[PDB]
Amino acid sequence: PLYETLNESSAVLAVKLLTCQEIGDGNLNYVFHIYDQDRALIIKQAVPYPLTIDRARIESSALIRQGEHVPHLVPRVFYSDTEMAVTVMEDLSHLKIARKGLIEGENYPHLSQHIGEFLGKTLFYSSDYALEPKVKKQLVKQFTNPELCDITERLVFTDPFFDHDTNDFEEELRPFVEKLWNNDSVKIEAAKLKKSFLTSAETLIHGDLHTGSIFASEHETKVIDPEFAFYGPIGFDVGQFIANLFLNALSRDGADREPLYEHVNQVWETFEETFSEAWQKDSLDVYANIDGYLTDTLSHIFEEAIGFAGCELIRRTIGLAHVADLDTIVPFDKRIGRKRLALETGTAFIEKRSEFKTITDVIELFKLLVK
Amino acid sequence: YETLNESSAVALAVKLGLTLTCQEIGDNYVFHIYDQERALIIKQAVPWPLTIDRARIESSALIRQGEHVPHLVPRVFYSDTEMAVTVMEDLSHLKIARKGLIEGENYPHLSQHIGEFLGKTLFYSSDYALEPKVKKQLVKQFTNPELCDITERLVFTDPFFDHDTNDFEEELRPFVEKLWNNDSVKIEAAKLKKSFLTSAETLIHGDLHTGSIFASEHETKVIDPEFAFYGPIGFDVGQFIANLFLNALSRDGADREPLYEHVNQVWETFEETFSEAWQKDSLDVYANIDGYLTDTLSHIFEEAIGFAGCELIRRTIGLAHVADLDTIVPFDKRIGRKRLALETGTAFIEKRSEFKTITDVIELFKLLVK
Numbered sequence: 001p002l003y004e005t006l007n008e009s010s011a012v013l014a015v016k017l018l019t020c021q022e023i024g025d026g027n028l029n030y031v032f033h034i035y036d037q038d039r040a041l042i043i044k045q046a047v048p049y050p051l052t053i054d055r056a057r058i059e060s061s062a063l064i065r066q067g068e069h070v071p072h073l074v075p076r077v078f079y080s081d082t083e084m085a086v087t088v089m090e091d092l093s094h095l096k097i098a099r100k101g102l103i104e105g106e107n108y109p110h111l112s113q114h115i116g117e118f119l120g121k122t123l124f125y126s127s128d129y130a131l132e133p134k135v136k137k138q139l140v141k142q143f144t145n146p147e148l149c150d151i152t153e154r155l156v157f158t159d160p161f162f163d164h165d166t167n168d169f170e171e172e173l174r175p176f177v178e179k180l181w182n183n184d185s186v187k188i189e190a191a192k193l194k195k196s197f198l199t200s201a202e203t204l205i206h207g208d209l210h211t212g213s214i215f216a217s218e219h220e221t222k223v224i225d226p227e228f229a230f231y232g233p234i235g236f237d238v239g240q241f242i243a244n245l246f247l248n249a250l251s252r253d254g255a256d257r258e259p260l261y262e263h264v265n266q267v268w269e270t271f272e273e274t275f276s277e278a279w280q281k282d283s284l285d286v287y288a289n290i291d292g293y294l295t296d297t298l299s300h301i302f303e304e305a306i307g308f309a310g311c312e313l314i315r316r317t318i319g320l321a322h323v324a325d326l327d328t329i330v331p332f333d334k335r336i337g338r339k340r341l342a343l344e345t346g347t348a349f350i351e352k353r354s355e356f357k358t359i360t361d362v363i364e365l366f367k368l369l370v371k
Numbered sequence: 372y373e374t375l376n377e378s379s380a381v382a383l384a385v386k387l388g389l390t391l392t393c394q395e396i397g398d399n400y401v402f403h404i405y406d407q408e409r410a411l412i413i414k415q416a417v418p419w420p421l422t423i424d425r426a427r428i429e430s431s432a433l434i435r436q437g438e439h440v441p442h443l444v445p446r447v448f449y450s451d452t453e454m455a456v457t458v459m460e461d462l463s464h465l466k467i468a469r470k471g472l473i474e475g476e477n478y479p480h481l482s483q484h485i486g487e488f489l490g491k492t493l494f495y496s497s498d499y500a501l502e503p504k505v506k507k508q509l510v511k512q513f514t515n516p517e518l519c520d521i522t523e524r525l526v527f528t529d530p531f532f533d534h535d536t537n538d539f540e541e542e543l544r545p546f547v548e549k550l551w552n553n554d555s556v557k558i559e560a561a562k563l564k565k566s567f568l569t570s571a572e573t574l575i576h577g578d579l580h581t582g583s584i585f586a587s588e589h590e591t592k593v594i595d596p597e598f599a600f601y602g603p604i605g606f607d608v609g610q611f612i613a614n615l616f617l618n619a620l621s622r623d624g625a626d627r628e629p630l631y632e633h634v635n636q637v638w639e640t641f642e643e644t645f646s647e648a649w650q651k652d653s654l655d656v657y658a659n660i661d662g663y664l665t666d667t668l669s670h671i672f673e674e675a676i677g678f679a680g681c682e683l684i685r686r687t688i689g690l691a692h693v694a695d696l697d698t699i700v701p702f703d704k705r706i707g708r709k710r711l712a713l714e715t716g717t718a719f720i721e722k723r724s725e726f727k728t729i730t731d732v733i734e735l736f737k738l739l740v741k
């Protein structure tokens with residue numbers, strides 16, 4: 001049985017393929033930076049408590065698949081190994097985590113075009129529109145992600161909507177939280193959204209595409225950390241990303257929000273064009289080119305995306321796993337206020353998801369609720 | 372793997388430990404074994420190629436079904452993947468329902484039974500009844516790529532275009548062509564196929580037509596779940612309802628009433644059974660929020676109807692026909708009823724989300740087939 005947790009030294013496997021430091025943000029994952037004194041490398045390895053190290057196989061394979069379609073939008077992987085639960089990948093230390101960058105006031109003018117093309121291509125080319133069902137059904141097996149899905153199933157879709165252990169919210173927030181716990185019609189909709197997440201095996205999704213999962217500079221965008229990858233609903237990554245743009249918007253004031261709104265607008269438009277051009281060129285489906293079918297498919301993805309976004313908005317505000325955008329808002333009272341707005345916009349997104357005709361409708365409703 | 376014969380079949384039976392005679396009776400080989408001094412079936416998959424792995428699916432699927440509705444599926448005594456054999460209870464004392472129904476048997480309990488079959492099989496293998504972690508494992512073991520590929524092609528694709536596998540009377544061409552030129556129906560057919568391709572909700576039977584049921588006045592056994600996989604809850608429901616309708620189309624006037632009552636009753640029973648199971652046995656913290664079960668039922672219903680429309684069309688002009696329609700006489704009356712199968716099927720797909728109840732479904736049908 002050949003699994004051994006790495007150190008700085010054992011990490012410099014690198015040779016078997018001058019200085020090293022562990023730089024990991026988590027505690028579930030080690031991240032080793034290696035630099036030859038002018039040339040650098042990353043070695044990521046899954047630690048076990050509980051949560052198996054099989055995630056490393058998922059993450060590794062998923063980056064590889066993503067690389068076959070959008071190599072410019074994800075780090076190159078040089079080597080990986082299941083038993084050791086290691087992924088050896090490109091260093092991106094010359095870039096900034098998009099969430100950290102956004103909180104600091106960077107605007108990243110190309111973030112939405114890039115993320116948009118990422119979503120369109122990754123989401124299209126792993127679905128039944130792009131692949132023979134026989135082949136696609138095999139990939140569902142290899143990407144079955146029970147333990148990481150269970151995290152999302154609980155935290156994104158469940159726990160925040162009831163009085164559960166894992167929730168974490170200010171007492172000042174209680175009354176609004178309670179208003180959500182008492183809201184049957186929203187909960188029903190969230191259940192529907194969960195059930196889609198549980199059963200809708202449409203494409204190989206990234207499964208955790210928030211702003212902490214992106215490296216960015218003025219001119220480049222890299223999507224990292226697809227360890228939640230499995231076959232899920234097409235609109236989930238779309239929704240989760242959008243929600244995080246809005247989460248940042250809530251941490252800004254007045255005119256400074258405009259870039260985030262423009263990014264929400266652009267990521268959708270670009271996702272739609274990208275998905276569309278790929279549908280046109282590379283669908284295997286005899287139905288693909290009947291006028292109206294693509295359009296209805298995009299309506300359904302769009303409605304799901306908004307519902308999922310609602311869930312992320314709420315879930316990041318009062319659930320186990322928070323975002324810096326909200327948690328570092330200051331002073332206290334302003335934090336609570338913006339946190340209330342995340343609940344309220346989230347709630348609106350879930351309930352009104354099927355009424356929106358365009359992304360602009362979404363932006364405009366948000367603008368209105370956060371005055 | 373060795374393909375069996377009358378003798379090696381007997382030997383297997385004796386070697387597993389269960390004055391013998393054997394005949395192959397398959398409509399896949401099916402070996403009937405009888406002790407003159409008690410009976411047994413041994414079904415084996417032959418290698419259209421098409422792997423023998425189906426026999427592993429079928430076998431495991433009868434076992435799962437047996438854990439919840441043992442009275443509605445044959446007992447399985449033994450099975451083996453490598454040999455692709457399933458050894459099961461003999462039901463020769465019963466009639467295939469489709470044959471029975473064409474002869475004029477009414478089977479008064481068929482819908483109650485199949486209703487409870489669907490309610491329980493379809494509930495107890497979904498995320499509502501099982502931990503997702505567990506459920507996702509079953510999805511792996513029931514992945515059915517080759518048998519799914521048959522259905523994806525024959526039920527949801529080929530009939531709707533001018534493809535190889537289609538098979539229909541020339542007299543029927545004009546109505547066929549009307550369907551092929553119908554963009555809006557085809558879009559709906561696409562959506563239904565996409566649900567069939569992606570919606571891994573439960574372990575479905577996958578081929579629950581009237582030729583996959585043994586029946587007598589008092590008993591009902593569902594056989595042949597070799598198409599089993601994780602798909603949409605409403606598909607078996609739809610496919611069964613459609614086959615009741617297909618029989619209706621082969622009857623005239625008053626004699627249709629039992630088929631309509633069956634459509635009505637199977638849905639009623641499916642609803643009540645699924646509902647009682649949800650009440651008792653859901654794991655879902657959402658399960659009891661008033662309105663959620665109802666909405667779920669509406670979506671199952673809506674899909675059921677869409678799938679049924681596909682089965683109506685597909686059985687009329689695709690590769691694999693049903694005796695109900697093909698044996699109608701005279702010719703001209705066949706064509707006429709075959710046109711109604713097209714037109715009711717088309718209605719079911721397009722109007723699927725408009726129907727308030729099963730009665731609305733029956734009533735629309737009755738209207739079109741006057």
Ligand SMILES: Nc1ncnc2c1ncn2[C@@H]1O[C@H](COP(=O)(O)OP(=O)(O)O)[C@@H](O)[C@H]1O
Nearest residue numbers: 023024025026029031042075090091092093225
């Ligand atoms: N390819 C890389 N290049 C440079 N730094 C990286 C790279 N991958 C991860 N890191 C650093 O290590 C941290 C952990 O990576 P991440 O994939 O977010 O781990 P986790 O899945 O544990 O959240 C990142 O936030 C980043 O700061």
Ligand SMILES: Nc1ncnc2c1ncn2[C@@H]1O[C@H](COP(=O)(O)OP(=O)(O)O)[C@@H](O)[C@H]1O
Nearest residue numbers: 396397398399401412445460461462463594595
């Ligand atoms: N358990 C059984 N008891 C009695 N006869 C059976 C049994 N299973 C199959 N048969 C006979 O053999 C035929 C083939 O059964 P079926 O499961 O439909 O095979 P296939 O999957 O090839 O269609 C049936 O129509 C039936 O007449």
Ligand SMILES: [Mg+2]
Nearest residue numbers: 212213224225
């Ligand atoms: Mg990360």
Ligand SMILES: [Mg+2]
Nearest residue numbers: 208225227228
């Ligand atoms: Mg991670």
Ligand SMILES: [Mg+2]
Nearest residue numbers: 582583594595
């Ligand atoms: Mg059969």
Ligand SMILES: [Mg+2]
Nearest residue numbers: 578595597598
């Ligand atoms: Mg069969």
